[PDB]
Design an enzyme around this catalytic site. Structure first.
Site, PDB file in Angstrom:
ATOM      1  N   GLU A  85       0.866  -1.177   0.000  1.00 57.36           N
ATOM      2  CA  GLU A  85       0.000   0.000   0.000  1.00 57.36           C
ATOM      3  C   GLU A  85       0.904   1.230   0.000  1.00 57.36           C
ATOM      4  O   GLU A  85       1.472   1.592   1.032  1.00 57.36           O
ATOM      5  CB  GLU A  85      -0.942  -0.002   1.200  1.00 57.36           C
ATOM      6  CG  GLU A  85      -2.180   0.845   0.969  1.00 57.36           C
ATOM      7  CD  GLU A  85      -2.668   1.535   2.225  1.00 57.36           C
ATOM      8  OE1 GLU A  85      -1.925   1.573   3.231  1.00 57.36           O
ATOM      9  OE2 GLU A  85      -3.804   2.049   2.199  1.00 57.36           O
ATOM     10  N   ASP A 130      -8.119  -3.460   7.816  1.00 55.80           N
ATOM     11  CA  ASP A 130      -7.070  -2.431   7.842  1.00 55.80           C
ATOM     12  C   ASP A 130      -6.446  -2.345   9.237  1.00 55.80           C
ATOM     13  O   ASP A 130      -6.040  -1.281   9.691  1.00 55.80           O
ATOM     14  CB  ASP A 130      -7.622  -1.080   7.385  1.00 55.80           C
ATOM     15  CG  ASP A 130      -6.538  -0.036   7.143  1.00 55.80           C
ATOM     16  OD1 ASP A 130      -5.402  -0.397   6.751  1.00 55.80           O
ATOM     17  OD2 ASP A 130      -6.838   1.158   7.347  1.00 55.80           O
TER      18      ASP A 130
END
Ligand code: NA
Ligand code: NA
Ligand code: NA
Ligand code: NA
Ligand code: ZN
Ligand code: ZN
Ligand code: ZN
Ligand code: ZN
Lengths: 385, 380, 379, 385
Positions: C129, C271
């Protein structure tokens, strides 16, 4: 060379029923025998010839999976390429661009003649009469309808080899689930023949066994079928409804009550196909015709023998569309799918026929909202009605 | 009562799409829906040539059209011109929309609405006051010096005159929102618009009775983050009816696709149209601000849009061809749903026996062939 | 080794089954059969009327159980995160390695490849990410490390695609030119941390991006009728998208709207960070101090820096706060994420022949145990 | 009243099937005989006593619209308030909190006794046995089933006046559409009696005429009905399916094949109700009972007389839920609606019964995922199994 495939041209000013969408403000470009482009109507090249459909409807040509005759001829009574050509030309007047010549219960000799005629026709014509539909003779005499009892039989090993050997010109065989011939269902399917259940008095379980072996269609639902006769006896009708197979139904209001079609559509959804099962009476004005030696009389759009048993129908596809919309209450776009896209899927021709998509064959039907056919394209060749 | 029939049409009733039927008008009412071959032979027939027939469209936000603006000429004549212009694009009823301006014009607009209603039924139905109880941060082209909070005297005036006021658009964060239960009790639809309120403050206004939202996305706090949903999020995450402009300039077509998926049968089409609709003009004045008209866009000096140049039938075409909404559903967004949003669906907005014969006939390239208003047919 | 789960409501992803048993054989789902047809002598796990479903797959997971993959690049970290995941019903995940220098990315690839020589169907592959993001939507990602990819780093990533499952990048970052290259090599490209316009985001989708990273968070929103941003491009598209269901990252009402629009393309991710499944007060995340106060993870400026939620907790919130039915919520945690990364042929649903990665849970959303490669372990 | 005073308590740790939602993490508060609140379980007032359902299911109590007997008794055989009390108590063990005592084809005197007994019962009990179901005697001989041919008849004007005069204790009359009694359907409906079609060999047209005159229910679909026997003969079954009326169906797998139920559910949607049609065998361990002079035997879940005619069912509502979920394939939440909410709507008691909403009566059933009933509340009074 020399524009043999033709000039490119465009249909404009039409509502286009593609099978997946209803398109407004679009034009459909044809190039040779293929659907070339679907584009905004104001983007059509000014140099293309245009067919102005005056706000009417455009859809993929209808595909009639059960058709014994029309325009005054019967395939059983005149087994020739000329008969097939006549039926094709007659079909165009009602929006049907492809069909299966249906050849019913009769001796082996005529069946082999039919195979020869079909292969001959297929050397000359593509995407029109597609292949034979043998309706019978491997049926049940308890549900014979207008079929001759003396010809209903079980298949020999030699005739089984013959039909398997000639699968490239046989699209569909209708047979009874309890007939001994059902043992060969996996063989037929392996050779590419669609196996359909019809003229069958089997129980629910025996019909489901034939479906398990590979039968994937049911011939004119309710007609010449063991019905749902009780809570505990569901018959061929219940087996077909309680399965995922495609099924054909006649929408003339005479073979099947419109209420039954309403029920069957709620159950079957996108597996219900419209067929005409039409006879020489369709597209012609006659008082009788011969159907394997039995005289069938034509009175008030009904085709029946001397004992009152119906022997085919006098309806066409566009008339069937009108009945499904106005009497059964199916929406127009779904009714059209039952006449082109779903029959195409049922016999596996949907990669090239049955819907309006770029790259598919330009077999097309234009029609009005009072259900008159304005013209057809076959392999991109437009002919006004 | 004069009787006649429409024949040779596909009839969109709001509940069905009918083929092979005829529609019989008796006086000002829809009298029968019959097989076309069963029309009595003594009735004259209007042959619609295979085209489409549906209930007349109802435009819930209309500032002006045909070169006039209601704010600029507050008169019965203005409302008559707007109605006559609307028929050319299939709109048989509308709410004359009067935007943010001083009290005196609001009182004039009420007087004119009442005078109009002494004479005309089922056409201009009642006032839509858009403003002035808005917010300065979402004023759009509305005049900042007139955006205010309502006095108790003007609150009484508006409730006292609810018989001719159909709707008021107000901001949820404006102190005027305290009176939402009063307005609703008097029979006035309260709409959320021109409002920078938070999600919570907008939801409070809906809980108090606000039942519409004015041109969704335009002059509204948006969904600006996962945690700040604003007025747009409160309207989408609610059951209320919502108006939206389908000219492709006020709202991206992709936004309309999303909002239709969320809102379903609560999404109404409005034009929010101005003098430019139904006319060929280059500018017009809107409470003193000039608004320029270029390529179907109405914008002020800063490029702020000030209304639209679109009509209902043009909006139908865009919803069908650019947004992908089916025709029968699109038509419901223009007649049946707005009828329900303002409570006139018992008499208008759909084709059923006994309802008023306010009707629109149109072609598949979205040209209006004609209208019936109270049963009186006029070809375009 | 063969055994059966009995006395369970079985959420297969296609059906909700009552009165059935699930037979496990080695690491595969062997059979689904009426419970009364299970042989007497076959060992049975009695789930006491509770629920059984395919194990959850977490596509965005920075750390949990007190460890962060960025901060401790080791096979041990991946083992700890996997065993912690089992306590909340998650049998597979993508170790998520965020915006940091190249050398750490290369370390992560080595560690991931070494882990995969020892473990299958657990930590599946890397989720990078960043760093090819945008500074306007950096979140807690370090501005100094957000960059555009060099030809040398483009080659390294494509060379090591065999252990890289997903890359999250911004649609307006020049790195987006390489989306077709990444996709051809078997890497899922996801849009995230992007201030792109609608058009530029759709351009990235047309080029091959097939996922979006934690929808609404660090994305240009639908800011007006005419400016739809990255959020609008993702919603007005057919791509899969991840969403966090902790009630802090995204309002439940937004998830309701997003579910209405995206249907079977909306996937739940945690997350999560070291705070999930641990009791810590703060941790450092690529130099950023992240404080942990009652399930919220935020830096000094109040920017969220990951989540402290688990998949089963997200299931509860999705069912009870968003209003999504149980069988659909479960699909958002196993079947849809399996399809989004292309492992649905072996994982993500209960079908005969697939891997027996399974989760058993109660109706107040406590996990009773898991099977991983058929090996059952009670919580 | 020296019974327990109505108080407030709550159910916690249950999955709540409300008919419109499936709720997790909620509690249900009962106040007297009413559902008082549906709240997050953490917000339950701390003073309240709490029934912990341990994660099992909670739904509105089942309503059984066709019940001849259970727990060893038959209402036809022992026309007494005591019989109605035993059936209600037995019903609770299978989750059924309201029912219509069903009184089959018999002489007028017994019918008058039943009206008397029903009225006295309703002076003592509310929301339990709701009112009479007269199944017959105005049927047809051809579809009599177990009903005595010698008692099937057409109604006199005096008996018609008697029934209409006592409509306050008569919920439903089942009659045949071709019986001359059908002329009185509008009279029965205007008086507040539900008219149901059953034990009828009528054609589709005659059945639809009865529906047009006000018949709004059909009694055990498929059983003792003219079927859809062909494409053109749809009978009573077809008239019921091709209409918007409510209809009951037995889900024991013996009266109706599960595949038929699949089809009927696809057609009827939220108009299909589950009934038991149960008998003294339900909730008891008996091998036989008496039913209007005939011995009926209980063997392998079947109830049949000495000549093998089926005479009711040995099934309960919770067993039918299990069969609908596991054998027919209907989702659990929809299956429950077919057992509480839809039958409530069918007979017009849905304002007070049949769903979990604030202000409605606290008639409730708790059950496990292997379809065992844990307990019921009736008028708010909880009783564990
Ligand atoms: Na073939
Ligand atoms: Na008013
Ligand atoms: Na990969
Ligand atoms: Na009554
Ligand atoms: Zn036939
Ligand atoms: Zn405005
Ligand atoms: Zn991120
Ligand atoms: Zn009966």
């Amino acid at each position: 060379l020399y524009k043999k495939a033709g000039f490119m041209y465009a249909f404009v000013n039409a509502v286009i029923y593609t099978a997946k969408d209803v398109l407004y403000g679009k034009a459909l470009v044809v190039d040779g025998d293929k659907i070339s482009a679907i584009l905004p109507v104001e983007d059509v090249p000014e140099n293309l010839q245009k067919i102005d459909l005056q706000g009417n409807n455009l859809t993929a040509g209808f595909i009639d999976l059960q058709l014994n005759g029309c325009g005054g001829v019967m395939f059983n009574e005149d087994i020739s390429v000329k008969t097939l050509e006549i039926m094709q030309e007659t079909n165009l007047k009602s929006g049907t661009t492809s069909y299966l010549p249906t050849f019913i219960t009769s001796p082996d000799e005529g069946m082999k003649d039919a195979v020869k005629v079909m292969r001959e026709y297929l050397t000359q014509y593509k995407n029109q009469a597609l292949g034979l539909h043998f309706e019978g003779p491997y049926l049940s005499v308890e549900k014979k309808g207008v079929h001759r009892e003396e010809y209903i039989r079980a298949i020999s090993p030699e005739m089984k080899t013959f039909l398997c050997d000639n699968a490239d010109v046989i699209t569909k065989i209708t047979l009874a689930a309890e007939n001994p011939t059902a043992q060969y269902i996996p063989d037929f399917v392996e050779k590419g023949i669609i196996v359909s259940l019809g003229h069958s008095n089997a129980t629910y379980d025996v019909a489901q066994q034939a479906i398990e072996k590979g039968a994937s269609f049911a011939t004119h639902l309710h007609n010449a079928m063991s019905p749902i006769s009780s809570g505990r006896a569901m018959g061929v009708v219940g087996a077909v409804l309680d399965s995922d197979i495609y099924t054909g139904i006649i929408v003339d209001g005479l073979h099947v009550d419109y209420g039954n079609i309403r029920l069957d559509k709620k159950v079957k959804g996108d597996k219900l196909c419209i067929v005409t099962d039409a006879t020489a009476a369709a597209g012609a004005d006659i008082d009788s015709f011969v159907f394997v030696g039995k005289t069938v009389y034509v009175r008030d759009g009904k085709c029946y023998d001397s004992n009152g048993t119906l022997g085919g129908a006098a309806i066409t596809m566009i008339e069937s569309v009108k009945n499904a919309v106005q009497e059964v209450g199916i929406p127009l776009d779904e009714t059209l799918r039952m006449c082109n896209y779903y029959p195409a899927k049922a016999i596996g021709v949907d990669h090239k026929l049955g819907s309006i998509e770029v790259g598919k064959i330009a077999n097309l039907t234009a029609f009005t909202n009072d259900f008159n056919v304005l013209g057809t394209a076959v392999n991109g060749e437009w002919k006004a009605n």
